[PDB]
Amino acid sequence: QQDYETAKHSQHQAKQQAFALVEIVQRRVHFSYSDSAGMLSENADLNDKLRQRLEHAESDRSRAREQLRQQQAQYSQFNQVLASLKSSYETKQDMLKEL
Amino acid sequence: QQDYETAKHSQHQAKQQAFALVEIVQRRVHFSYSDSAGMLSENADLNDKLRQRLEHAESDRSRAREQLRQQQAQYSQFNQVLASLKSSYETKQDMLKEL
Amino acid sequence: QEKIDRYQVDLEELSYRLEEQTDVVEEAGELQAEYEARTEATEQEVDELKSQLADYQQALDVQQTRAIQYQQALQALERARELCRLPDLSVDNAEEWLETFQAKEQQATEALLALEQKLSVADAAHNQFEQAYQLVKNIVGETSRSEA
Amino acid sequence: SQLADYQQALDVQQTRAIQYQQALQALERARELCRLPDLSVDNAEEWLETFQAKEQQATEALLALEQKLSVADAAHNQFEQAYQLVKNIVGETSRSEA
């Protein structure tokens, strides 16, 4: 299994390299007209600042999602312990009524 | 030994077929890129098609979200019932010990 | 009478535990709802920022003129150059590299399948070993594999 | 991001189209190897699990085979002695039935 894990890693790397070479082959045509050029950086200032703000918002969203997931977790374990207590109490109550 | 080499060849056939099917399972999303391949062929203004694809993806993601939420509720229900049985078994076993 | 008294005390303690855990679960559920609202607010903000950036850049990126298209080819070529240990890698000679690396990839897949066959047979042999072990444990109880 | 960053400049679109072509090639290759022209991405999982069962059958077979070959290392003498013991106990019997 260790050997097969190594082999799978190697296969993945080989596949990635082959795909990169295929990408070069596909974009040879785009390289063909590499001499072309155009205007750039017209509204970059506001666009860059808004990109930075959006990156901050995305990071905050990732934090929020992580906190949401973990809180779902702890709520789950709390519910599970609550159900365990419920079952224990019900069984002991049944047994007291029997006695 | 002859039958065993034959069985090994059959196992190799099964292995290659299963690997191929798994590979297409991985490329499952890539078949969704048929829109991307068609979109890329636009070679012109294509933001509206991008927005349409994004809306379709939003619909799919919302469907998956609802599916996941209801499945999570079902799994949680199963987990509470399992925990309740665990506690009940513990209590019954302890009473059997005591009796 | 004493036994029933003990069980009544047990039930009282269990009721106290149930109250405590119900309170904990209610607090956890309130926090969960709060974090749900907070998260949804964060995706709302992120989507709003993305849409506003799209609107602002609408005019900017429409007139691409297929002239800034080739830098993508440049980045792809360079990315292959570091990923593929071929500093001389040229879009001209990249086809020989493509075929050679494809040959290596298919060889790797064949070796992977060869390893997978033996891996599967070995794992299933261990599975039967384990099944024997569980049968022995259930019949007699704990014991080592050597004694099996 | 693509719509917001339309400056992305269809690079991701190009990669996705290339991935689509690769997926087409892979699907054709599987339809060949598995000989299943009747096949779709949505239902390919069913044939995948079917051939998973097939591969499990083949591997379990070859596993019993590996055990039998490993125990076949027993020399010629043991087979003879067991055969003659069974013969002497029950009377003449065939090796296959022994």
Report DSSP state, residue C68.
Answer: S
Which residue in this structure is represented by tokens 């292995």? B15
Which residue among D20, D44, D65 places its CB closest to the CB of B7? Answer: D65
Which residue among B76, B83, B88 places its CB closest to the CB of A91? Answer: B88
Q: Are A82 and C27 in contact (CB under 8 A)?
A: no
- From A19, A41, D10, select the one nearest C72 (Cα to Cα): D10
**Rounded CA gap, C118 and C16, in Å?**
58
A36-44 long-range contacts, CB within 8 A, separation 24+: A36/C65, A36/C66, A36/C67, A36/C69, A36/C70, A37/C67, A37/C68, A38/C63, A38/C64, A38/C65, A38/C67, A38/C68, A40/C68, A42/C60, A43/C56, A43/C57, A43/C60
Chain C neighbors of A45, CB-CB under 8 A: none
- Cα→Cα distances C143→B30, C57, C146, Å: 52, 72, 8
Q: Which residues contact C61 (CB under 8 A, 6 or more apart)?
A: D5, D6, D7, D9
Q: Are A57 and C46 in contact (CB under 8 A)?
A: yes
Which residue among C62, C66, C117 places its CB closest to the CB of B15? Answer: C117
Termini Cα distance of chain C: 50
Q: Are A43 and C60 in contact (CB under 8 A)?
A: yes
Instruction: Report the residue of chain C nearest A5, measured CA to CA.
Output: C112
Instruction: Report the residue of chain A nearest D16, measured CA to CA.
Output: A23
Which residue in this structure is represented by tokens 């995706």? C43
Cβ count within 10 A of residue D19: 19
* DSSP secondary structure, C71-109, as one string: HHHHHHHHHHHHHTT-TT--TTTHHHHHHHHHHHHHHHH
Residue A41 contacts D, CB cutoff 8 Å: no
**Rounded CA gap, C21 and B98, in Å?**
28
- From C93, C104, C77, B29, select the one nearest A20 (Cα to Cα): C77
Q: Do B47 and C117 touch (CB under 8 A)?
A: no
CA Rg value for chain A: 30
Selected for mutation to probe chain A from C102, C106, C121, C126 (highest A CB count within 10 Å) is C102
**Rounded CA gap, D57 and D14, in Å?**
42
Residue B34 contacts C, CB cutoff 8 Å: no
D77 burial class (0-12, 13-18, 19+ CB within 10 angstroms)? Answer: exposed
- Which 3-state string (H, E, C) describes D38-97? CCCCCCHHHHHHHHHHHHHHHHHHHHHHHHHHHHCCCCHHHHHHHHHHHHHHHCCCCCCC
Q: Are A62 and C45 in contact (CB under 8 A)?
A: no
Give phi and psi for A47, each to the nearest 5. Answer: -60, -45
Torsion of CA D15, D20, D26, D30, to 10 degrees: 160
Which residue among B76, B80, B87 places its CB closest to the CB of A88? Answer: B87
Cβ count within 10 A of residue A95: 17
Q: Count Cα atoms within 13 angstroms, Cβ side, for A71.
A: 21
* DSSP secondary structure, B1-15, as one string: -HHHHHHHHHHHHHH
Q: Count Cα atoms within 13 angstroms, Cβ side, for C101.
A: 24
Q: Do A22 and D4 touch (CB under 8 A)?
A: no
- From A57, C32, A77, C135, select the one nearest B80 (Cα to Cα): A77
Selected for mutation to probe chain C from B6, B8, B11 (highest C CB count within 10 Å) is B11
Selected for mutation to probe chain A from B19, B82, B87 (highest A CB count within 10 Å) is B87
- Cα→Cα distances A59→A52, A56, C104, Å: 11, 5, 40
Report DSSP state, residue D8.
Answer: G
Instruction: Report the residue of chain A nearest B83, measured CA to CA.
Output: A84
Ramachandran area for residue D10 (φ above 0: left; ψ -120 to 50: alpha; else beta): left
Residue B8 contacts C, CB cutoff 8 Å: yes
Residue C104 contacts A, CB cutoff 8 Å: yes
**Buried/exposed B23-62: b ≥16 CB within 10 Å, e otherwise:** bbeebeebbbbebbbebbeeeeebeeebeebeeeeeeeee
**Rounded CA gap, D76 and A59, in Å?**
73
Chain C neighbors of B15, CB-CB under 8 A: 113, 116-117
Identity at A99, one-letter amino acid code: L
Torsion of CA B93, B94, B97, C2, to 10 degrees: -140
- From D25, C17, A24, select the one nearest B24 (Cα to Cα): D25
Q: Which of residues 5 through 34 in chain D touch B, CB cutoff 8 A? A: 6, 10, 13-14, 16-17, 19-23, 26-27, 29-30, 33-34
Q: Are B72 and B61 in contact (CB under 8 A)?
A: no
Termini Cα distance of chain A: 57
CA angle B37, B42, B45 (to 5 degrees): 130
- From D77, D78, D82, D83, select the one nearest D92 (Cα to Cα): D83
Which residue among B76, B83, B91 places its CB closest to the CB of A91? Answer: B91
**Rounded CA gap, B19 and A13, in Å?**
17
Resolution of the experimental model, in Å, one decimal = 11.0
Selected for mutation to probe chain B from D1, D51, D69 (highest B CB count within 10 Å) is D51
Q: Which residues contact C133 (CB under 8 A, 6 or more apart)?
A: C145, C148
Q: Map residue A57 onto helix, strand or coil.
A: helix
Cβ count within 10 A of residue C75: 12
